[PDB]
Amino acid sequence: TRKESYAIYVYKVLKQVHPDTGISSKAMSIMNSFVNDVFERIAGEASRLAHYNKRSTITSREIQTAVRLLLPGELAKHAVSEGTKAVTKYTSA
Amino acid sequence: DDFRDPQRWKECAKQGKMPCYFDLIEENVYLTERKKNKSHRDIKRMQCECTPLSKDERAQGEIACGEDCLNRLLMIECSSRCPNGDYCSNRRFQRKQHADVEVILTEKKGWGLRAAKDLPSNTFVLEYCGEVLDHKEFKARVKEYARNKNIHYYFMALKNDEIIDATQKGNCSRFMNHSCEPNCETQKWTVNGQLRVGFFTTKLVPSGSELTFDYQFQRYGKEAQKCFCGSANCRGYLGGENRVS
Amino acid sequence: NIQGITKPAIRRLARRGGVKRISGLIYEETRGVLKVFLENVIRDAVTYTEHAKRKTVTAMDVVYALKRQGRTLYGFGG
Amino acid sequence: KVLRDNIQGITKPAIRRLARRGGVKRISGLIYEETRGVLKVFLENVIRDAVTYTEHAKRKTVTAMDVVYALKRQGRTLYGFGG
Amino acid sequence: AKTRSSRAGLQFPVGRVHRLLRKGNYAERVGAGAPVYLAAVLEYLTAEILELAGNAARDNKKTRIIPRHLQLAVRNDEELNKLLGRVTIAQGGVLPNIQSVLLPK
Amino acid sequence: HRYRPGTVALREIRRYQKSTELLIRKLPFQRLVREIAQDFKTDLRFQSSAVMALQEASEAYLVALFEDTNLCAIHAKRVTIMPKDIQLARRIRGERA
Amino acid sequence: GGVMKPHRYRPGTVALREIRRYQKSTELLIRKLPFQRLVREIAQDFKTDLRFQSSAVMALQEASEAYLVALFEDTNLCAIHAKRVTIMPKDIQLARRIRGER
Ligand SMILES: [Zn+2]
Ligand SMILES: [Zn+2]
Ligand SMILES: [Zn+2]
């Protein structure tokens, strides 16, 4: 049956960054686990923020502040820049 | 004195001024070798964590992979993939960085080597190389040769079931005597996976001093022997009636 | 400012912690650890405040900040 | 078939090897039994949680996902087996 | 372009992210910018980690990134290590480290 | 007369361990908090309750840290906590690198 | 005439060699089948008649080995702080106390 994964997108990114480098099945699974873990943490933090502010929706602001609470300094900064850039590009297009 | 030439001169067996009766050996050759060793399966490369420069020699420079190198502290020499490359000071068995030696008569007991010049402590002198024997072959060759009425038995057990023979072919490190005051010692080094033995010093041997290490007492037959050094506690005879090996 | 955490106060804290003999360099090391701890907690609390669009840091924000850090606090409307 | 004294299956050489991967050089004799106890405690906790999840699931077989959930519960998240 | 990821110029599936957010009971409603933002964050983290993982695999003369590489990468980078400070990587191993007092003199 | 060194400390341990009142005077602590907070954002206000919560958490954390430090120093056959003890404690905790 | 052996290593050297050896690889150190038997016993006492996916056992073993390696690291740290070089049980207890384990 269908067992969804981030395998393909991880491959795309990898080749974007290391075109000439493979990934093992075990490594691929680990990467998938990392992706899911970060997703869950950010989503939970955002939901918590939504609840704390008596708000019934999650917007990119909640995600952004969640990242700011979760990731470290430089990592958080670059992640925030990327997220805002992607949001702006999506809005424009 | 040594005068190693390929033409065999007039010399019966004394190995003095004409050591050209036997054939020399450069590396210990194996007989029953097989791909059942930890050579390239697990120990592929024990690279050292050095960060040399190599851009400063003869001025404020240091010898790479010194006593602070891990490999040297481990009784292991760096491989060809050392970060210095050819400036590594560990590959001494490959480059054959021996020391000055000479074989002459020094006592009626037998031929011996005396230091020619200064030789600081912890310095490679020579290497032990010879024919490595098998299990069933050792017990047969010893008994066949024991009846050959000979005094020198160049037998050295590298491991529990590997004895090296330097009788038929022996390098310069075969004339060394024994005494109760060892100024040298042997060390079991691992180069390229294979185990190798060497000969290092322990003190500031002056110029013109003997170079012998402490043998390990052991007997095989009923007969016994004794030494002739007489340093301070020259036991000579074996340590009791021993039979182990 | 930071030094306002007086050495004897650090001694009192340690005593409540069960310490009997205290070293000189302790005091400053404790000051540093306290500064770091406060930095993290207040950082998170501000972040919470900012997302709330408030110029006044609330207790609740402190509470969520501590809870994030796995240092849950009781007695301020948990 | 009954299972008994399987804790001693964790032989001394194995514990020594682990301690090597931990950066330990010289191992006191009593360390082995204490390590056995610690491992037994940790395994008991993790297996309690995993079995609990399996029970709720109404399954007679423990699945890797159960183990991963249990570990994440213990603040010891593991990558490499899903989730 | 049709794909929302193409609209945002992203490699990850924005649609899948949106579904996930909605099928996770994180809030009553989900905004349209959050899936994009979160997908961008996930992409950025994956790229950052993969860079070091590939570099490590290179250092070990290997064409494929294996778990050892992922470990090495994460544990050597201070920030990544902090993000995954309470995480275990199957087959990860550890960074080679020996305490000073254990070295011979 | 004179109390022998090391006795009044025990009395104080008994004394402080039986009470719960905060041990850092409020105003310097509050000024420290405001100074620290300022570096993240300007013109910020604090509910006194928030400051009290901050102080509660900080003092409780410090007491726990010192408990661990005393444990370490005892293990090191010592009776005087020393910086290295706190460093070891925090390291094992996972707080410091 | 006898056969003599070269020399003997000083203590602790092979300890270091092993340390680097196992710090270079990643393969699991505890043997598999005893571990499986121990796990089966422990589960049995929590509930009878349970079966296991092999992958579940493997994940359990990975987490166990990781936990133990970290524990030994902290133990070694404690041993060093106690001006010693041999880790001793009390070191483990101190590590587990400070960790907040019981
Ligand atoms: Zn080196
Ligand atoms: Zn070298
Ligand atoms: Zn003698």
Swiss-Prot record, chain A:
Molecular function as annotated in GO:
DNA binding; protein heterodimerization activity; structural constituent of chromatin
> Which residues carry a glycan?
81
Q: Does the keyword S-adenosyl-L-methionine apply?
A: no
User: Origin, by domain of life?
Assistant: Eukaryota
Identify the keywords attached in UniProt to this record, alphabetized: Acetylation, Chromosome, DNA-binding, Glycoprotein, Isopeptide bond, Nucleosome core, Nucleus, Phosphoprotein, Ubl conjugation
Where found?
A: Nucleus; Chromosome
**An example Gene Ontology CC term for this record:** nucleus
Q: Does the keyword Transmembrane apply?
A: no
Similarity comment text for this entry: Belongs to the histone H2B family.
Question: Subunit notes for this chain?
Answer: The nucleosome is a histone octamer containing two molecules each of H2A, H2B, H3 and H4 assembled in one H3-H4 heterotetramer and two H2A-H2B heterodimers. The octamer wraps approximately 147 bp of DNA.
The protein's name in its UniProt record:
Histone H2B 1.1
Species this chain originates from: Xenopus laevis
Q: What does the organism's lineage look like at the top?
A: Eukaryota, Metazoa, Chordata, Craniata, Vertebrata
Curated annotation (Swiss-Prot), chain B:
What effect on the protein does mutating residue 138 to A have, as reported in its record? Strongly reduced methyltransferase activity
Q: Please explain the role this protein plays, according to its UniProt record.
A: Histone methyltransferase that specifically trimethylates 'Lys-36' of histone H3 (H3K36me3) using dimethylated 'Lys-36' (H3K36me2) as substrate. It is capable of trimethylating unmethylated H3K36 (H3K36me0) in vitro. Represents the main enzyme generating H3K36me3, a specific tag for epigenetic transcriptional activation. Plays a role in chromatin structure modulation during elongation by coordinating recruitment of the FACT complex and by interacting with hyperphosphorylated POLR2A. (Microbial infection) Recruited to the promoters of adenovirus 12 E1A gene in case of infection, possibly leading to regulate its expression.
Q: What post-translational modification information does the record give? A: May be automethylated.
Q: Where is the Post-SET domain?
A: 223-239
Which consequence is recorded for altering residue 219 to P/W/K/Q? Loss of methyltransferase activity
Q: Which gene encodes it?
A: SETD2
Residue positions annotated to bind Zn(2+) 2 are: 65, 78, 82, 88
Report, as the record phrases it, the tissue specificity of this protein: Ubiquitously expressed.
Q: What is this protein called?
A: Histone-lysine N-methyltransferase SETD2
Q: Provide the residue positions that the database annotates as binding Zn(2+) 3.
A: 180, 227, 229, 234
Residue span, AWS domain: 43-97
Positions contributing to S-adenosyl-L-methionine binding:
109-111, 152-154, 177-178, 225, 228
The similarity comment for this entry is: Belongs to the class V-like SAM-binding methyltransferase superfamily. Histone-lysine methyltransferase family. SET2 subfamily.
Q: What species does this protein belong to?
A: Homo sapiens
- Source organism phylogeny: Eukaryota, Metazoa, Chordata, Craniata, Vertebrata
Q: What is the effect of changing residue 174 to H/G?
A: Loss of methyltransferase activity. Abolishes ability to monomethylate STAT1
Name the positions where Zn(2+) 1 binds. Answer: 48, 50, 65, 69
Positions modified as Phosphoserine? Answer: 245
Please name every pair of cysteines joined by a disulfide bond in this record: none
Region (Interaction with TUBA1A) location: 1-245
Curated annotation (Swiss-Prot), chain D:
Its signal peptide is: none
Residue positions of the PTM N6-methylated lysine? 1
- Post-translation: what modifications? Demethylation is performed by JMJD6. Monomethylated, dimethylated or trimethylated at Lys-1 (H4K20me1, H4K20me2, H4K20me3). Monomethylation is performed by KMT5A/SET8. Trimethylation is performed by KMT5B and KMT5C and induces gene silencing.
Residues modified as N6,N6-dimethyllysine: 1
Principal location class: nucleus
Q: Where, per the database record, does this protein carry N6-butyryllysine?
A: 12, 25, 58, 60, 72
- Note the position of the cross-link Glycyl lysine isopeptide (Lys-Gly) (interchain with G-Cter in ubiquitin): 72
* Residues carrying N6-methyllysine: 1
Q: Where is the PTM N6,N6,N6-trimethyllysine found along the chain?
A: 1
The Phosphoserine modification is found at: 28
Q: Which UniProt keywords apply?
A: Acetylation, Chromosome, Citrullination, DNA-binding, Hydroxylation, Isopeptide bond, Methylation, Nucleosome core, Nucleus, Phosphoprotein, Ubl conjugation
Q: Which residues carry this modification: N6-succinyllysine?
A: 12, 58, 72
- Please give a single GO biological process term from the UniProt record: nucleosome assembly
User: Which residue positions does Phosphotyrosine occur at?
Assistant: 32, 69
Q: Which residues carry this modification: N6-acetyllysine?
A: 12, 40, 60, 72
Q: Where does it live in the cell?
A: Nucleus; Chromosome
**What's the subunit arrangement here?**
The nucleosome is a histone octamer containing two molecules each of H2A, H2B, H3 and H4 assembled in one H3-H4 heterotetramer and two H2A-H2B heterodimers. The octamer wraps approximately 147 bp of DNA.
Q: What does this protein do?
A: Core component of nucleosome. Nucleosomes wrap and compact DNA into chromatin, limiting DNA accessibility to the cellular machineries which require DNA as a template. Histones thereby play a central role in transcription regulation, DNA repair, DNA replication and chromosomal stability. DNA accessibility is regulated via a complex set of post-translational modifications of histones, also called histone code, and nucleosome remodeling.
Q: What is the name of this protein?
A: Histone H4
- Identify the species of origin: Xenopus laevis (African clawed frog)
Q: What is the lineage of its organism?
A: Eukaryota, Metazoa, Chordata, Craniata, Vertebrata
From Swiss-Prot, chain E:
The modified positions for N6-glutaryllysine read: 82, 105
Q: What residues form the membrane-spanning segments?
A: none
- Which positions are linked by Glycyl lysine isopeptide (Lys-Gly) (interchain with G-Cter in ubiquitin)? 2
The N5-methylglutamine modification is found at: 91
Record keywords: tRNA-binding included?
no
Task: State where the protein is found.
Answer: Nucleus; Chromosome
Keyword Acetylation listed? The answer is: yes
Q: How is it modified after translation?
A: Following DNA double-strand breaks (DSBs), it is ubiquitinated through 'Lys-63' linkage of ubiquitin moieties, leading to the recruitment of repair proteins to sites of DNA damage. H2AK119Ub and ionizing radiation-induced 'Lys-63'-linked ubiquitination are distinct events.
A GO BP term, please? heterochromatin formation
Give residue numbers for the modification (N6-(2-hydroxyisobutyryl)lysine). Answer: 23, 61-62, 82, 105
Mind listing the UniProt keywords for this protein, alphabetically? Acetylation, Chromosome, DNA-binding, Hydroxylation, Isopeptide bond, Methylation, Nucleosome core, Nucleus, Phosphoprotein, Ubl conjugation
GO cellular component terms given for this protein: nucleosome; nucleus
Which positions carry N6-succinyllysine?
82
MF terms (GO), sorted A to Z: DNA binding; protein heterodimerization activity; structural constituent of chromatin
Per UniProt, subunit arrangement is: The nucleosome is a histone octamer containing two molecules each of H2A, H2B, H3 and H4 assembled in one H3-H4 heterotetramer and two H2A-H2B heterodimers. The octamer wraps approximately 147 bp of DNA.
Protein name in UniProt: Histone H2A type 1
Give the organism, scientific name. Xenopus laevis
Q: What is the lineage of its organism?
A: Eukaryota, Metazoa, Chordata, Craniata, Vertebrata
